[PDB]
């Protein structure tokens, strides 16, 4: 009967915190703790730049920062009392709309006629053309909200499940075997909750696919 | 009445997670036939299987979040 | 003097990236609608 609370403290200090977790030394040889960060950055950058292979690869140097930021913010939430900034819908809403708008306006800046012609899937039955067009434009307008929700909802749900099962364990003053089993379930869930990085990958990869489709 | 609505709405909403269970079952099953046809388990065969499991689990937990909101 | 570090990237990708004005307009309209509810 404990009310879940994703409270709103002074956001700026919490949000800026993951940035300080990555130092950038100006040395030929790094500090064997930024080195792993650099290697991960290169490994992910290769995967992200493989698909584009265009002049839009300039966007990749910002998408790397995007994926690093989202991953750092979401991975830090697994701590006992950490407040996930991505739990709040505000910042993810403020991230999904501008980037989708950037993708569509970049598409409309160069080869604009063909960018709008991407609605045409090279012909398709003419009898159902208006239905297909309205479906695809409604999907395109859905895409930003979809991108925001597919991050916010499950990021909140992980913490919600952790809180629920933890409260169940704490309230379980009964047979200790059941308590131990529920604690094992908790640890298994938290190991699964570490897959929030896969959510970062999904978000950034969907954004990359949209940008590549429109550019 | 309102508490009864909370209970019935939660009981309904939690039934929507069954489709995500079917999806994770389907993808993890397809994992095994992909492995059988091509013994490259450590590769994208298992990487994208994990990706699909995470995506469907997201589709299920993002559903049960509504039930959690209804209950509280 | 951190502006010059990413000044080229700023106007390089914000030609369409700096459309956060749409986000600000949407947020302001939503806040006005909620204040009408409020």
């Amino acid at each position: 009967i404990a009310p879940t609370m994703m409270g709103l403290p002074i956001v700026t200090l919490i949000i800026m915190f993951p940035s300080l977790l990555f130092p950038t030394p100006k040395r030929l040889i790094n500090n064997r703790t930024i080195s792993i960060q650099q290697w991960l950055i290169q490994l992910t950058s290769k995967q992200m730049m493989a698909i584009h292979n265009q002049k839009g690869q300039t966007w990749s140097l910002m998408l790397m920062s995007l994926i690093m930021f989202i991953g750092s913010t979401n991975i830090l939430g697994l701590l006992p009392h950490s407040f996930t900034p991505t739990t709040q819908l505000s910042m993810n809403l403020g991230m999904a709309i501008p980037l989708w708008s950037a993708t569509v306006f970049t598409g409309f800046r160069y080869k604009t006629k063909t960018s709008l012609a991407h609605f045409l899937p090279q012909g398709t039955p003419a009898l159902l053309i208006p239905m297909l067009v309205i479906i695809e434009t409604i999907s395109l307008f859905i895409q930003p909200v979809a991108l925001a929700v597919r991050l916010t909802a499950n990021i909140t749900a992980g913490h919600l499940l952790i809180h629920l099962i933890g409260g169940a364990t704490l309230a379980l003053l009964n047979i200790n075997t059941m308590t131990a089993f529920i604690t094992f379930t908790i640890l298994i869930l938290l190991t699964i909750l570490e897959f929030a990085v896969a959510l970062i990958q999904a978000y950034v990869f969907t954004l990359l696919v949209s940008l590549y489709l429109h550019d | 009445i309102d508490t009864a609505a909370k209970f019935i709405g939660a009981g309904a909403a939690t039934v929507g997670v069954a489709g995500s269970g079917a999806g994770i079952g389907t993808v993890f099953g397809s994992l095994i036939i992909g492995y059988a046809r091509n013994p490259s388990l450590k590769q994208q065969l298992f990487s994208y299987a994990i990706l699909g499991f995470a995506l469907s689990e997201a589709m299920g937990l993002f559903c049960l979040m509504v039930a959690f909101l209804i209950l509280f | 003097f951190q502006f010059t570090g990413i000044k080229k990237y700023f106007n390089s990708y914000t030609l369409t990236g700096r459309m956060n004005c749409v986000l600000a307009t949407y947020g302001g309209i939503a806040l006005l609608v909620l204040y009408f509810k409020l």
């Binding site: 950038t24 920062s65 | - | 570090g5």
Partner: peptide
């Protein structure tokens, strides 16, 4: 609990984006 308001949460993220991209621009392969 439920997200409301949406004023300053969506404002600090742009500054953090600036900071993160400036930081990672120094990173090189």
């Amino acid at each position: 609990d439920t997200s409301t308001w949406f004023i300053t949460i969506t404002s600090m993220i742009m500054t953090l984006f600036i900071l993160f991209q400036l930081k990672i621009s120094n990173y090189s392969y």
